Structure formats: C-alpha cells, structure tokens
Symmetry: C3
Subunit: 114 residues, 3 copies
Amino acid sequence: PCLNLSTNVNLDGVDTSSILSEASSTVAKIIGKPENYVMIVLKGSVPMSFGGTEDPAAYGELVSIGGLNADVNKKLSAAVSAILETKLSVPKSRFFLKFYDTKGSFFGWNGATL
Amino acid sequence: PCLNLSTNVNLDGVDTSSILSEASSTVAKIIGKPENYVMIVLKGSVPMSFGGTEDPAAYGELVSIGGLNADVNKKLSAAVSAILETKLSVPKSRFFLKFYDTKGSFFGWNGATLL
Amino acid sequence: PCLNLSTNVNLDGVDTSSILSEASSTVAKIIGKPENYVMIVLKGSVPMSFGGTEDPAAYGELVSIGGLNADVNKKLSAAVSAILETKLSVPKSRFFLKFYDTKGSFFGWNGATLLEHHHHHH
C-alpha cells in the first residue's frame, strides 16, 4: 500500500527519515501487510488552506489492494494523525485522509500488475 | 472536500494566499458545504507536460463525500479554471480536474472517519 | 489521460523534459489516446520510503477516460517503469502505479467536463 501525504509544514530542519519510518511500520502493522510492500510519500512546504486558514494542515491518500474498510480505516486515521500531531504539530482536526481500495489489475508494481 | 492542485507556474511573486482563499470559498459555495470543511492544496513549479508542451498547465483532483454529479462537476470546473486563468495564466484548455466521490467510511478526519 | 508521478530523486540532476516527452508519447501510444489529451506531471526531491528504505523510489497515478484494462495496465506498468529505470535510476521494484478509469463527466477540462456522448471503451 501507499500513504501519500502533503503538508504546509516546512521539513527543511526535520528528521523526515524518522517520520517515514514510523509511518511505514505503523501502516504495515494496522493494515496487516509486510512492511516490504509499504510506501510512504511526504511532501512538505506545500501551500494549503483548511477551513479558510493557512495554519499547519495535511492532506493524505492511502491506496491499498484490499484490506480497507470502516474499522481499518478508522484505526489508520487515528494512528497516522497521531504521527502528524506529534512530529509535525498538525492537529488531527486539520488532517484529511482519503482511502482508496484498488483492484490489483489496476495497480502496477515491479513492471507488471497485481 | 479537498481540491488538490499542481501547476508548472512558479508561485513566487504570485499572491498564493488569494488563490487559496478564492478557491476555498468557490468550492464551498458550489459543492454546498461549510468552508470549515474545505481544504485547498496548491503546489507550484512542478514539471509538467500537456499535449507534449510545457506551457503553463495545471492538474487537479477534487475529492468530496457526495455532492458530485455531472452538473456540479461542470460548475466546479468552470469556476476553478477561471481562477487559474486569471491568477496563474493557465489556460482552461491546459487544466485537467479529476473529481472523486468518496464514502464517509473511506475519508479520514479528526483521527477517525466521516462515518 | 494524466500520469502523475512523485520521486525522491533530485530532478536538478536529470533532463526532466525528456522524461516528460517520453512518458507523454508512451502513454499516448499504449492507451491509444491523442497526445493532445495527454498530461504528465513529475515532482522530484520528495521524501519517500519503500520497504522501509529511502533508496530511489517513485509513486504514480494514471487516470484515463476509458482505455484501461488488465492488459493495457500491464503494458503501461512495464513501459513507464522502464522510463523511470533508465532516466531516474528508480528500480521497477520500487515503483507503484495506481490506474483509474474515470467517467468523462467526472473529468474536468476546458472549463467544463468531458461528459461522454457515445459509449465508454476499455
């Protein structure tokens, strides 16, 4: 699966490696897939508005071949939001996370599809 | 809802806050949701090609829990494309905008989902 | 269609226009779409991890009004991954590509939508 994040928080002084690593293991554990198949993308310094203000915020998308449903999505939202609160000071009230369950035939990896 | 935009235009010198504010209010009015729940994301200086050329262009995605249909989508495309033409000189013929309707159980906010 | 890509590789160090042009031609030819309607987006220097490491990687999404199916998607995966291998040194084992078949009425262009008047085709 892939967790693809954008934030207006500037990452120039941040240990992004630690954020990626925590997100990577957290997603693997909750979605129940080996971490070998987990991708995390984190774009910072992205202009954003949420609720009309430019205070720190984040937008994410999480794509997986199956494994996504109301319970898992709630648990992933809680856990990822806690990483963004602690490590980026993005409140969970300013984090939107879109989930997408893709068919394997519509997901490319290793030059082929699933 | 969230409108997530990328453009090859450089935002330096551009009043980025006014673009965000105009887009935020426009999306809120057309989709019919309080602006409290509208997110706008705008990345500039992104390498992109449209039609094989690198003239000003933009790609957007708009995600929402319902409220999307052919009529709403046409109105959103017209309004957002007008912002990009006037504020970034991105011609509407070089702007693609993918609309996605999501279930609330598949949209996270506030540490949970919108279910 | 639009192919929208992110990578941790630094594009200051590569001819980015040649990647855009080769991807644009490749998507047009494999889906079978006029190149006038092909958009390629490429963001670089993006923090990423895949499998817990930060070696070169890429994430993409390809949206198209029709023209996508299991066979075409496999060909697109192979061809686009080969561009990133040769031009960005991103191994195909570190490249994920989501495909999405959209209705025209859910795809804005030219200040309206591409609402379809005939049948949709995979």
